[PDB]
């Protein structure tokens, strides 16, 4: 179990750690989050009390370094940093633990939510979508745009998601225009799976990372990416059976975890109705269809 200590909490802030959130008051004696499970990526995220504009946070894996948070009063945000002096870090974390100035990751012994939301997400891939190589962790916020969005303006602060575009030459073989547009199996399996992602795990990892950025930061381009990646599978007549089965499990926990009151902006009526009721895979997403219909029947 790992720890992200905080130097202090100078400004009133709602802190989020995975699907968990807590309230920290201005200058409350707060020094971090302990008992973070090893073996998964994590996201620590922030919404200031005074300006709910800009949710923001950091994707990190404790196996890759000792990380802490320190408010910066100049840039006005909680910044993640790496401590290279390991002895200094252990000493700091132990003191804060002894003084019980760290809140606890409440991981229940029946709860597999985070695992099922991050199953194929890897930090190495996150760091290639979020390009900032000098840090082992990755900053994301509400306002960052995607590469594709920038095509349709700062490239250093972009989300370099894989560009998916159904009316592109990449997506449509010359001479198979109607075939390839109505049955995207070529684009899914040859262009994307075999060509770009190399395997289904990487494809699912970006999909899951796109959803989480959509959910935690309300990042709109992430939501676009998440829906495009779903649609490209649902609109493919030929998809490996294991991908379909895993997809259903993936979407199930995403729909399960979405806040009830955010469904209206995070869920695209057209893609979901198409995917669940018109597409080739309309009958292959049993779990996902059942929870969608029992929880958000309005969108459908």
């Amino acid at each position: 179990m790992n720890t992200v200590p905080f130097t202090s909490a100078p400004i009133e802030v709602t802190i989020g750690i995975d699907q968990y959130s807590f309230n920290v008051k201005e200058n409350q004696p707060f020094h971090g989050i302990k008992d973070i499970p090893i073996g998964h990526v994590h996201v620590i995220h922030f919404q200031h009390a005074d300006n709910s504009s800009m949710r923001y946070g950091y994707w990190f894996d404790c196996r890759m370094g000792n990380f802490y948070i320190q408010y910066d009063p100049k840039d006005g945000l909680y910044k993640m940093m790496e401590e290279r002096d390991g002895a200094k870090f252990e000493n700091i974390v132990h003191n804060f633990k002894e003084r019980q100035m760290m809140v606890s990751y409440p991981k229940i012994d029946e709860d597999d939510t985070w695992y099922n939301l991050t199953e194929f997400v890897q930090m190495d891939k996150i760091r290639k979508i979020v390009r900032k190589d000098e840090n082992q962790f990755s900053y994301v916020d509400s306002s960052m745009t995607t590469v594709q969005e920038n095509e349709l303006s700062d490239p250093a602060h972009s989300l370099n998601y894989t560009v998916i575009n159904f009316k592109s030459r990449e997506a449509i073989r010359p001479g198979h225009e109607m075939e390839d547009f109505l049955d995207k199996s070529y684009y899914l399996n040859t262009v994307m799976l075999q060509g770009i992602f190399k395997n289904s795990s990487n494809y699912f990892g970006e999909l899951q990372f796109a959803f989480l950025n959509a959910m935690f930061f309300g990042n709109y381009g992430s939501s676009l990416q998440w829906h495009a990646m779903i649609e490209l599978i649902c609109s493919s007549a030929t998809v490996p059976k294991h991908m379909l089965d895993k997809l259903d499990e993936i979407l199930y926990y995403q729909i399960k975890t979405l806040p009830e009151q955010y469904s209206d902006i995070l869920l695209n009526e057209r893609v979901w109705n198409i995917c669940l009721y018109s597409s080739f895979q309309k009958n292959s997403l049993h779990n996902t269809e059942k929870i969608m219909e029992n929880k958000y029947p309005e969108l459908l």
């Binding site: 009316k167 030459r169 449509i172």
Partner: protein, 237 residues
């Protein structure tokens, strides 16, 4: 974006454009079978591709062989149309290729966009106008060439005959749309109007009769009467 009443005069500027209509591409007669079920039999069709500024018509005849062994013909027809328009554009010299292609039905937008991905600079546009190009098979010489065709064939016409010698494209297109709208509302009356006078003939190289200017004004008036009429006869007004 969409072509409508407010940007109507863009049709007659000097940027090359084509209207495409796919209404007559896939055509069937519906009949009973010996067992009393219903079946369709396709008849020859055509793509109606028209430069509204010049009158040039690119009549691509769709022979019923193109449907043999195919499923979902109404959907295929939209893509067959897009394949043929794309081939037409590629066949033309660069300085003759259109800058815009306006489709008369929105279901052609995606088929044509995909077939034209090689031509990113050609705008594929819908329209809100209800254009009467479906009535193009009411023009005898056009229907005749479609029905006689034994293989795929492109035939080239000027749908304005020689009108541009005496009137502007805007007027030539108003006349064409009025003739076609009449032929669509009541083909028999329309054709009656157009032929009633045996001294006014259609030249071998033309589609419509050789009316003088004065005679076109009478004809045009008679076509508007017919259109207002059938509208009453329809709505009882």
């Amino acid at each position: 974006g969409a072509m409508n009443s407010s940007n109507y005069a863009e049709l007659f500027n000097n940027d090359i454009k084509l209207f495409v209509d796919d209404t007559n591409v896939y055509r069937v007669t519906v009949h009973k079978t010996f067992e009393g079920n219903v079946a369709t039999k396709a008849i020859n069709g055509c793509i109606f591709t028209l430069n509204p500024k010049t009158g040039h018509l690119f009549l691509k005849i769709i022979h019923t062989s193109v449907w043999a062994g195919q499923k979902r013909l109404s959907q295929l027809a939209k893509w067959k149309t897009a394949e043929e328009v794309s081939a037409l554009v590629r066949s033309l010299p660069k300085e003759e290729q259109p800058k815009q292609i306006i489709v008369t039905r929105k279901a052609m937008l995606d088929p044509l966009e995909v077939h034209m991905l090689d031509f990113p600079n050609i705008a594929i546009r819908p329209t809100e106008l209800r254009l009467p190009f479906s009535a193009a098979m009411s023009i005898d010489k056009l229907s005749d060439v479609v029905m006689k065709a034994t293989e795929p064939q492109m035939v080239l016409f000027n749908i304005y005959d020689d009108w541009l010698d005496r009137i502007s494209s805007y007027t030539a297109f108003s006349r064409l749309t009025l003739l076609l709208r009449a032929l669509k509302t009541n083909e028999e009356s329309a054709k009656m109007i157009l032929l009633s006078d045996p001294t006014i003939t259609i030249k071998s190289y033309h589609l419509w009769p050789s009316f003088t200017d004065e005679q076109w004004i009478t004809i045009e008036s008679q076509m508007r009467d017919l259109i207002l009429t059938e509208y009453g006869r329809k709505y009882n007004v």
